[PDB]
């Protein structure tokens, strides 16, 4: 198992309910369609208008390598139009998951 | 939902085996006994011995409040002490969760 982490910058914080709308409805919406992601989730870090962020992405995948091939599909493509229009990702963190994890009952 | 992400470095990246062990038979063994902790997971970033860092952690809580308390318990300052012996956090990355997430079937 795998996790890809960016830091997502808003090219103007006035857009962020935009941005937040189509995480929701239309980002989310679209995982099931990428067969390499696992657990995908957005975070809300800062809506300062000069913050070197504003948001985090969590993307935990099969292995990168099916991650690769899904960034390659039209599905994906769509996305990263939309995306581009609001954001930047201004960092990646990636690594490989140690054991099974946590998770809670 | 919450998310607190560390980039964490190795004082020692010959420990790194030492430090992996612990994660997984320790550190994620004791969640159980964190109640704020929903998801729990640590991924191996780099090897290089002067990276920046080495491993992130990505840790899903119900909220910070809930968290801060956890961090009081000696449960929480038994962890602390043997990271601590390994290992420094280098930066904290938070945010609050967008809606739901995606989780695949």
Chains 1, 2 share one sequence.
Not at 71 to 92: D, H, I, K, N
């Amino acid at each position: 198992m795998e996790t890809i982490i960016h830091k997502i910058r808003l090219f103007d914080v006035a857009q962020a309910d935009a941005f937040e709308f189509w995480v929701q409805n239309v980002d989310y919406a679209t995982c099931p369609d990428l067969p390499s992601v696992v657990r995908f989730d957005v975070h809300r870090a800062s809506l300062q208008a000069n913050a070197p962020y504003h948001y985090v992405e969590v993307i935990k995948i099969t292995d990168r390598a099916a991650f690769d091939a899904d960034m390659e599909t039209s599905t994906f493509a769509g996305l990263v139009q939309a995306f581009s229009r609001m954001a930047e990702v201004v960092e990646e963190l990636a690594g490989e998951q140690l054991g099974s994890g946590y998770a809670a009952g």
